Design a protein around this ligand. Structure first.
Ligand SMILES: *[C@@H]1O[C@H](CO)[C@@H](O[C@@H]2O[C@H](CO)[C@@H](O[C@@H]3O[C@H](CO[C@H]4O[C@H](CO)[C@@H](O)[C@H](O)[C@@H]4O)[C@@H](O)[C@H](O[C@H]4O[C@H](CO)[C@@H](O)[C@H](O)[C@@H]4O[C@H]4O[C@H](CO)[C@@H](O)[C@H](O)[C@@H]4O[C@H]4O[C@H](CO)[C@@H](O)[C@H](O)[C@@H]4O)[C@@H]3O)[C@H](O)[C@H]2NC(C)=O)[C@H](O)[C@H]1NC(C)=O
Ligand SMILES: *[C@@H]1O[C@H](CO[C@H]2O[C@@H](C)[C@@H](O)[C@@H](O)[C@@H]2O)[C@@H](O[C@@H]2O[C@H](CO)[C@@H](O[C@@H]3O[C@H](CO[C@H]4O[C@H](CO)[C@@H](O)[C@H](O)[C@@H]4O)[C@@H](O)[C@H](O[C@H]4O[C@H](CO)[C@@H](O)[C@H](O)[C@@H]4O)[C@@H]3O)[C@H](O)[C@H]2NC(C)=O)[C@H](O)[C@H]1NC(C)=O
Ligand SMILES: *[C@@H]1O[C@H](CO[C@H]2O[C@@H](C)[C@@H](O)[C@@H](O)[C@@H]2O)[C@@H](O[C@@H]2O[C@H](CO)[C@@H](O[C@@H]3O[C@H](CO[C@H]4O[C@H](CO)[C@@H](O)[C@H](O)[C@@H]4O)[C@@H](O)[C@H](O[C@H]4O[C@H](CO)[C@@H](O)[C@H](O)[C@@H]4O)[C@@H]3O)[C@H](O)[C@H]2NC(C)=O)[C@H](O)[C@H]1NC(C)=O
Ligand SMILES: *[C@@H]1O[C@H](CO)[C@@H](O[C@@H]2O[C@H](CO)[C@@H](O[C@@H]3O[C@H](CO[C@H]4O[C@H](CO)[C@@H](O)[C@H](O)[C@@H]4O)[C@@H](O)[C@H](O[C@H]4O[C@H](CO)[C@@H](O)[C@H](O)[C@@H]4O)[C@@H]3O)[C@H](O)[C@H]2NC(C)=O)[C@H](O)[C@H]1NC(C)=O
Ligand SMILES: *[C@H]1O[C@H](CO)[C@@H](O[C@@H]2O[C@H](CO)[C@@H](O[C@@H]3O[C@H](CO[C@H]4O[C@H](CO)[C@@H](O)[C@H](O)[C@@H]4O)[C@@H](O)[C@H](O)[C@@H]3O)[C@H](O)[C@H]2NC(C)=O)[C@H](O)[C@H]1NC(C)=O
Ligand SMILES: *[C@@H]1O[C@H](CO[C@H]2O[C@@H](C)[C@@H](O)[C@@H](O)[C@@H]2O)[C@@H](O[C@@H]2O[C@H](CO)[C@@H](O[C@@H]3O[C@H](CO)[C@@H](O)[C@H](O)[C@@H]3O)[C@H](O)[C@H]2NC(C)=O)[C@H](O)[C@H]1NC(C)=O
Ligand SMILES: *[C@H]1O[C@H](CO[C@H]2O[C@@H](C)[C@@H](O)[C@@H](O)[C@@H]2O)[C@@H](O[C@@H]2O[C@H](CO)[C@@H](O[C@@H]3O[C@H](CO)[C@@H](O)[C@H](O)[C@@H]3O)[C@H](O)[C@H]2NC(C)=O)[C@H](O)[C@H]1NC(C)=O
Ligand SMILES: *[C@H]1O[C@H](CO[C@H]2O[C@@H](C)[C@@H](O)[C@@H](O)[C@@H]2O)[C@@H](O[C@@H]2O[C@H](CO)[C@@H](O[C@@H]3O[C@H](CO)[C@@H](O)[C@H](O)[C@@H]3O)[C@H](O)[C@H]2NC(C)=O)[C@H](O)[C@H]1NC(C)=O
Ligand SMILES: *[C@H]1O[C@H](CO[C@H]2O[C@@H](C)[C@@H](O)[C@@H](O)[C@@H]2O)[C@@H](O[C@@H]2O[C@H](CO)[C@@H](O)[C@H](O)[C@H]2NC(C)=O)[C@H](O)[C@H]1NC(C)=O
Ligand SMILES: *[C@H]1O[C@H](CO[C@H]2O[C@@H](C)[C@@H](O)[C@@H](O)[C@@H]2O)[C@@H](O[C@@H]2O[C@H](CO)[C@@H](O)[C@H](O)[C@H]2NC(C)=O)[C@H](O)[C@H]1NC(C)=O
Ligand SMILES: *[C@H]1O[C@H](CO)[C@@H](O[C@@H]2O[C@H](CO)[C@@H](O)[C@H](O)[C@H]2NC(C)=O)[C@H](O)[C@H]1NC(C)=O
Ligand code: NAG
Ligand code: NAG
Length: 304
């Protein structure tokens, strides 16, 4: 039945991307797949040296969630990432997710969101992903019109996060000075900070810049530096037809609704893909989609 492995390939290309790209594309294949004619054809590659073309039988009411897909994890400690000696393994399947909530920025419910911030991270010397987790307060409710609300110490929190990310990258070599900024492009230049949010089915897009207007430095001053007064909401505009971030492309999905849905969600799990490759850059990024959801609970998604 299930006969996985534990191998991975990491390289240079993101358009010719593999695990990621494959995981993403296939997902909307499984997902777009819930509409009924009589008999459907599903694939089923995840790394076997050949492929499975899954075939659902039926006719020509309550159903779980993935007409054809399932997940499972290893086991042992709270979390790390990769280079395991992996052993015991568990059982799981359903995928109702579309129903519930989500975001490109901060994973929702966090659980024993201990005061002391976290940077829980799957490492790769240079090209890697993070998961920051602090107790402090953050809220994020959406109001359907296309504008999202908050509550918390978000300036300060980032500080912690920025206070956080300083302790583990220790003295590299030379006597140095820090200078954090963000982007997240690839091969081309945009110049905007988008985030998405799922909560109750509608797949809503947000133009998020005021939230993301901060240049970081080691030791600073703002006495003689400048001051203007700014406040915040979210100029979201649903894009059922999804305008794709990491690539100026397109996708869609077929949702439900409760007329006046006015989103809501608890913040905890702020994410990032920090870039620090040899030279002059500490490059925070915000791509970390649906497999992070389950990755959020287990340690690391395994699908098939
Ligand atoms: C879905 O779930 C979510 C949960 O996430 C629900 O949303 C949450 O629910 C709470 C209550 O419904 C809500 O509380 C409210 O929060 C507001 C947050 O706004 C603040 O943050 C943002 C970002 O920084 C800013 O835009 C804004 O300026 C605010 O700072 C607050 O506006 C409200 O609380 C405060 O105001 C009222 C009225 O004045 C006070 O009663 C209350 O005490 C708060 O203010 C005092 O305390 C703060 C901090 O201690 C001080 O800064 C402030 O000056 C006040 O200090 C005075 O007053 C108190 C006495 O009251 C006294 O201690 C002190 O001596 C001073 O005199 C507001 O009540 C959560 O924040 C909210 N989350 C979100 C999204 O913000 C949501 O409803 C759910 N959906 C459904 C189903 O409804
Ligand atoms: C695989 O492993 C993960 C961690 O590695 C495991 O390593 C080996 C040695 C195993 O044999 C495990 O001991 C260890 O789990 C698992 O994470 C763990 O998952 C368990 C659930 O099976 C968690 O326990 C739960 O957490 C609550 C926290 O309390 C814990 O601490 C106190 C005091 O130390 C203890 O009393 C508890 O037993 C916990 O250890 C706890 O409140 C929960 O109890 C409730 O739930 C049961 C079940 O329904 C219910 O009957 C009872 O009445 C309670 O209401 C519960 O015990 C544990 O926290 C967690 N620990 C770690 C280190 O992550 C992982 O789940 C497991 N599964 C997978 C994914 O493979
Ligand atoms: C993630 O989980 C979140 C909470 O998780 C908890 O789940 C339970 C089962 C436990 O396991 C906990 O360990 C765990 O933390 C969920 O977030 C919640 O979202 C819901 C709606 O989606 C919100 O519901 C409403 O909450 C009100 C809270 O405000 C109160 O607090 C203030 C602060 O002082 C008080 O002033 C207020 O008076 C409030 O008391 C609450 O009052 C509401 O309850 C009333 O109304 C409802 C409906 O009419 C009714 O059911 C209830 O009996 C009362 O009449 C209301 O329920 C909620 O704000 C929010 N929880 C938190 C953290 O506050 C979330 O669903 C889940 N999401 C994901 C990612 O899965
Ligand atoms: C990646 O790229 C960045 C940007 O190019 C490099 O940063 C530069 O670092 C050099 C180091 O020599 C800087 O040169 C120094 O500038 C000082 C003043 O500017 C700084 O300090 C003030 C106040 O603190 C700030 O207002 C300002 O913004 C700057 O932060 C000078 O005072 C220095 O002269 C003194 O030091 C020299 C030794 O360097 C002594 O011998 C002298 O006695 C003298 O007292 C010096 O000139 C330069 O300013 C930076 N660039 C920019 C754009 O400002 C990184 O080095 C680079 N990193 C890597 C890994 O390559
Ligand atoms: C994350 O953020 C990083 C920093 O913001 C991004 O790196 C930057 O990527 C842009 C896009 O390609 C590059 O911009 C180019 O700059 C070159 C270099 O010209 C400079 O050097 C010469 C020689 O000293 C000097 O004469 C000039 O005046 C310039 O100072 C230009 O030739 C190009 O036209 C183009 O503008 C940067 O090179 C690069 N910045 C850094 C830090 O080096 C990164 O793209 C982001 N990506 C991720 C991973 O999220
Ligand atoms: C940020 O969250 C905390 C947590 O409080 C909430 O916790 C959940 C589980 C729920 O029970 C909800 O009802 C709670 O509000 C809130 O911060 C704390 O707020 C309390 C009072 O609401 C404070 O207690 C007071 O402390 C002061 C100073 O020590 C005393 O003067 C008072 O007598 C009283 O003891 C406490 O200090 C706050 N500390 C924490 C844990 O952050 C807060 O409401 C919330 N902020 C918002 C609105 O975003
Ligand atoms: C991942 O985190 C867990 C969570 O523990 C944190 O919990 C809070 C409350 C705080 O105390 C913080 O210090 C904890 O790290 C870690 O789980 C705990 O780990 C300790 C030691 O790492 C365990 O004690 C051990 O007990 C065994 C017997 O089982 C001894 O043989 C060992 O020598 C040691 O003394 C403790 O049981 C764990 N408790 C909890 C709450 O899970 C975990 O270690 C950490 N993993 C890593 C390394 O990232
Ligand atoms: C991290 O960001 C800082 C500051 O960012 C500012 O500039 C851009 C990137 C934008 O985000 C804006 O909103 C920010 O306030 C970078 O430091 C400064 O970068 C600017 C932009 O190139 C430089 O300005 C220069 O100004 C002269 C004026 O004569 C022009 O002629 C030049 O063309 C040029 O634009 C300036 O060199 C930088 N200031 C410092 C600190 O010396 C920083 O480069 C960036 N670092 C990383 C990690 O990428
Ligand atoms: C949560 O705990 C921190 C303690 O954090 C300390 O231990 C590690 C997390 C490490 O990062 C270390 O650098 C850090 O100091 C509390 O911060 C504390 O604030 C108190 C104020 O009473 C000070 O006495 C301490 O300097 C400081 N740390 C210590 C050692 O306690 C934080 O406020 C606390 N909050 C909650 C809700 O638990
Ligand atoms: C990010 O990683 C690079 C290189 O890491 C090497 O790891 C090997 C397993 C293999 O994948 C090889 O292709 C890859 O280049 C780091 O470069 C190293 O820098 C240190 C410090 O000077 C030196 O010990 C090495 O000479 C040098 N590379 C080698 C192995 O020759 C790079 O510094 C690191 N960057 C950061 C800041 O994380
Ligand atoms: C690199 O610059 C650092 C800046 O700190 C210098 O570090 C000093 O090293 C000297 C010895 O040369 C020590 O006595 C001091 O304690 C350090 N400075 C202080 C007070 O922080 C160092 O000089 C530079 N490295 C060299 C020699 O190239
Ligand atoms: C990758 O996994 C294969 C099984 O497909 C295994 O034989 C091999 O050791 C692994 N190669 C490495 C080390 O990446
Ligand atoms: C592929 O999955 C189907 C379920 O549709 C299962 O019956 C079949 O055994 C699998 N193919 C093989 C031989 O791995």
């Amino acid at each position: 039945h299930m006969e996985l492995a534990l191998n991975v390939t990491e390289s240079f290309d993101a358009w010719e991307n593999t695990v990621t790209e494959q995981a993403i594309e296939d997902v909307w294949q499984l997902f777009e797949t819930s509409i009924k004619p009589c008999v459907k054809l599903s694939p089923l590659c995840i790394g076997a040296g050949h492929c499975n073309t899954s075939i659902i039988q039926e006719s020509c009411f309550r159903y779980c969630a993935p007409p054809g897909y399932a997940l499972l994890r290893c086991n042992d400690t709270n979390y790390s990432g990769f280079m395991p000696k992996c052993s015991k393994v568990v059982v799981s399947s359903c995928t109702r997710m579309m129903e519930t909530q989500t975001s490109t920025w901060f994973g929702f419910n966090g659980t024993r969101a201990e005061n002391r911030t976290y940077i829980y991270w799957h490492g790769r010397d240079n090209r890697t992903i993070i998961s920051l987790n602090k107790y402090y307060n953050l809220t994020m409710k959406c109001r359907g019109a296309g504008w999202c609300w908050f509550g918390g110490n978000w300036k300060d929190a980032i500080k912690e996060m920025k206070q956080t990310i300083v302790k583990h990258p220790r003295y590299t070599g030379t006597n140095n000075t820090d200078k954090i900024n963000l982007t997240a492009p690839r091969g081309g230049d945009p110049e905007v900070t988008f985030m998405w949010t799922n909560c109750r089915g509608e797949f809503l897009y947000c133009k998020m810049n005021w939230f993301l207007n901060w240049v970081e430095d080691r030791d600073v001053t703002n006495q003689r530096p400048k001051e203007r007064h700014r406040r915040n909401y979210v100029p979201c505009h649903i894009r059922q037809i999804i305008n794709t971030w990491h690539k100026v492309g397109k996708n869609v999905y077929l949702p439900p609704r409760e007329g006046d849905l006015t989103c809501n969600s608890t913040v905890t799990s702020l994410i990032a893909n920090i870039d620090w490759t040899d030279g002059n850059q500490t490059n925070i990024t915000m791509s970390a989609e649906v497999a992070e959801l389950y990755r959020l609970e287990l340690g690391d998604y395994k699908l098939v």
